[PDB]
Amino acid sequence: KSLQYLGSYIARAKKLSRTQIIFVASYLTSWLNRYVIEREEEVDQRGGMERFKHFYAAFQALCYIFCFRHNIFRDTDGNWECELDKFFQRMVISKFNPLKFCNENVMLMFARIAQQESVAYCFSIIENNNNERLRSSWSLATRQQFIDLQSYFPYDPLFLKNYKILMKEYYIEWSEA
Amino acid sequence: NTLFDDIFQVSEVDPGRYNKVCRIEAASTTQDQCKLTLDINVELFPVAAQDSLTVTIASSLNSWRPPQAGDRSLADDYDYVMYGTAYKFEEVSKDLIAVYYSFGGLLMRLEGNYRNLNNLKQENAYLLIRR
Amino acid sequence: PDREKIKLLTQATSEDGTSASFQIVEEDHTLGNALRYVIMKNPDVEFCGYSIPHPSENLLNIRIQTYGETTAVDALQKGLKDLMDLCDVVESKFTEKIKSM
Amino acid sequence: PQNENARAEALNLANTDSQYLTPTSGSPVRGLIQDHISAGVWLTSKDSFFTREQYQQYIYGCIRPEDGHTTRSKIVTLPPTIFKPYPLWTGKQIITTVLLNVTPPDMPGINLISKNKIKNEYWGKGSLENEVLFKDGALLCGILDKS
Amino acid sequence: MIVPVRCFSCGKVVGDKWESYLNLLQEDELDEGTALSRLGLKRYCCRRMILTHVDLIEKFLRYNPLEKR
Amino acid sequence: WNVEKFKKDFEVNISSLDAREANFDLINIDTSIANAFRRIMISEVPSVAAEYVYFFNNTSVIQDEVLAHRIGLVPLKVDPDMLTWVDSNLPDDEKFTDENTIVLSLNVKCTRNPDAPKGSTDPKELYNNAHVYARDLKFEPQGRQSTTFADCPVVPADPDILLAKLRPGQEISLKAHCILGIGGDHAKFSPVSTASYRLLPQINILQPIKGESARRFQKCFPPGVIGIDEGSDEAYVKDARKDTVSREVLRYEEFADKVKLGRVRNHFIFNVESAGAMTPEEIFFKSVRILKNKAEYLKNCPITQ
Ligand SMILES: [Zn+2]
Secondary structure: OHHHHHHHHHHHEOOOOHHHHHHHHHHHHHHHHHHHHHHHHHOOOOOOHHHHHHHHHHHHHHHHHHHHHHHHOEOOOOOEHHHHHHHHHHHHOOOOOHHHHOOHHHHHHHHHHHHHOOOOOOHHHHHHHHHHHHOOOOOOOOHHHHHHHOOOOOOOOOOOHHHHHHHHHHEOOOOOO | OEEEEEEEEEEEEEOOOOOOEEEEEEEEOOOOOOEEEEEEEOOOOOOOOOOEEEEEEEOOOOOOOOOOOOOOOHHHHOOEEEEEEEEEEEEOOOOEEEEEEEEOOEEEEEEEEOOOOOOOOOOEEEEEEEO | OOOOOEEEOOOOOOOOOOEEEEEEEOOOHHHHHHHHHHHOOOOOEEEEEEEOOOOOOOEEEEEEEEOOOOOHHHHHHHHHHHHHHHHHHHHHHHHHHHHHO | OOOHHHHHHHHHOOOOOOOOEOOOOOOEOOOOOOHHHHHHHHHOOOOOEEEHHHHHHHHHHHHOOOOOOOOOOOOOOOOOOEEEOOOEEEHHHHHHHHHHHHOOOOOOOOOEEEEOOOOHHHOOOOOOOOEEEEEOOEEEEOOOOOO | OOOOOEOOOOOOEOOOOHHHHHHHHHOOOOOHHHHHHHOOOOOHHHHHHHHOOOOOHHHHOOOOOOOOO | OOHHHHHHHOEEEEEEOOOOEEEEEEEOOOHHHHHHHHHHHHHOOOEEEEEEEEEEEEOOOOOHHHHHHHHHHOOEEOOHHHOOOOOOOOOHHHHOOOOOOEEEEEEEEOEEOOOOOOOOOOHHHHEEOOEEEHHHOEEEOOOOHHHHOOOOOOEEOOOOOEEEEOOOOOEEEEEEEEEEEOOOOOHHHOOEEEEEEEEEEEEEEOOOOEOHHHHHHHOOOOOOOEEEOOOOOEEEEOOHHHOOOOOHHHHOHHHHOOEEEEEEEEEEEEEEEEOOOOOHHHHHHHHHHHHHHHHHHHHOOOOEO
8 A cells, every 4th residue: 555655656746856756766676676686586486476466566656656757767868767777677577577467557558658768668578468368376365455456546636626726736647747 | 917827617607686797606727726706797798607717816017097099018918807906815724825805896705725826915906807 | 258257276276287176157067067078088188077066056166187298277178179169060960961851 | 153252162162073972872973864875885886887987977076175175186086996898996996085085195094894784695695795894995895884 | 726828847838728628528528538639738747737627717706796696 | 089070970860840849869979968958958048938017907816926927938939039138237217128028918808798698608608808818918019120020920829828717897907028038047938848858769689589479578569669570480679769668578577588678878869849939940959059159158268267
């Protein structure tokens, strides 16, 4: 839930400074790079992909953050803060296969944007994923709450007339990003 | 490898109260002291009195699965083959011995000279019969 | 799609997938018996049977174990396909005999 | 019952499962009746044979391996009694197979010498079907009965 | 009460067969099993339906609250 | 085994086909599949029957629900292909359409007859409209149906079914909605006055039987089953197909030793009677098709873990 809050917040909160954002990206890629380095070995071992809920959760948040704020992560040179080009690919091809277990609509939007930015190419991994589907296992008794939890974004737009107007100064609508 | 064979001649074929199984009593033609009692699915292998049956007990054939392309085994040499367990041995006299087999309930009792039945152990075994 | 029709019973399916149990909703002996007949003709199948937990829950349990050439899910598919083809053969034969009658 | 203490008691003290023996004399109160006895005399008869197809089907229809009795997560079967001319299993093997799939695997099979209600004379000359023999968990002789 | 419409077991329509069955016994002076056959009732399922029907309704009908006896 | 090996060996024999009943053999098919067709024909081949009955008045001696029930048992001569299925998740207004439903009405009042031949027992001459028949269900076409069903009005397959009886002053007034359904749901939807099979007789004689035994032996089976040959004087089987398998032979001690009674074992003799809506052959075709779709619908469903 926090990770959803975290990702939604960074994306939406207009008054955030470039560096506070890079701060959150730098925390997430850092925490993520460690997860894959210390844990990838546990996947072909006994258990399910649920053992790694928390991994996907964080990777979602980071992907989500990239959707709304990718234009910021290019420094003066045109290089990527946090080596996002090199970093995303590594996770996408990892054994966790984030693309399969995270929210479907975000993973899709990240694909679109990431591909556009020469940052990562996920679209073949997606193809492979829903092909294997028609023909990496997780119960579904508990797999749904997760899909549920990953669908909720606490700072998706408001629908209260006044509050909305009041928030405008503090909000980034998707159209803006 | 093979543990026992002999040609037996059937004395009696009793259908009891069943209609697929018969109890066979038969004596060896080679040993005066070797006799046999055996339940047989006679629907798959009919037997009449005075028939002569060759009877082989073997430890293996040279786990079970339906026959495939080009499988060959000791079973090929015979008409009727059963798999079962030895479950009792007994002294009948100073000279003779009897071993008891069960083939999922169809019972065999083989009595004979203790040297003639030397190779029989209390293990599992295949039974092979041909006419 | 429809995801609620057939499911894997992961507590009786092996790691190598050469053995598995499936629970199919809304099916009794009709399909169950016919499907096991077909599946058992597949030479790589080592074991197969179906069962009906209870007459009051519409459920059908199929078990498949293979000798290791194909997975259990493969055998289910070949069986299902084999069954479809088998019906075609019957329909066509019946048609011809009605015409020729 | 409406609270966990009462739950625990109904599942561990007053539950059916323990109460196999009566406290009066310490003898069984639970068993099968009617159809099931008649059926047993027939299924375990020497005249009873089953093809691979039938044998496997009787097994799975009664085991319910999708239960708490994952003694294995794969059903075990015996080799057939008759190998040739045709693969056949006996009824007594269905029983052995049942026990084999529901007793603990890290534990030797049951050993019992008992008797049933039907005299040997009823089956024919030389029968021993009145004697019930279990060796290492396998029914090697005798039919199963009300007894 | 009145003829059943279908045979309980067969599913076969039987309700068109009561009035004729009576006329067969009455007019043509047949026995019951011959008459049942002539109406096409082959399975004992179906023969039972007409053979043993009791037209109890004809009793109920004699009490009609809507006419001056 | 192999589907081609099956094709080469499978065979159909059609003894008698008629608008109401079929008698035919399926040869060299497995019992599991014959049984499937049989089950499907009885319980899964859709049919049209009255499902909802709307009473406006019934002052007959027969109670509403009972009257409704019998109307539901009336086999309607309607091609089920001419109708689509009702979706039972919509409200009543949206539920019933011109592709969904067929409407029948029934409207009888019984009056006393003045011109009754004095001293009469017959209710036809004593009362007007004493007896109500299935044929009295009037087909009221709705919307497009005036066109679609113009070439085939909706009529009960058995017009002379007795539905109700009345006496002077009593009236029945109802509309019925008739829809698609299957026998497995309720037997009123079953399209058969029964589909069943028997396995073919095999009477095989285990040694010659002649003379006075032959005549004796022959009389243990229906006329024509067992023949006595001229010459060898021995008995032989003419056609087992006429045998009823009474096992009468097995009673007489002298024969019980010399005859085995079996079947040509898969060999299935099917008898299919239609309730009146579709022909037998259509009902059997529809079942062979239904089985195939089950297999096809399943092959294409994704297996969820
Ligand atoms: Zn009937």
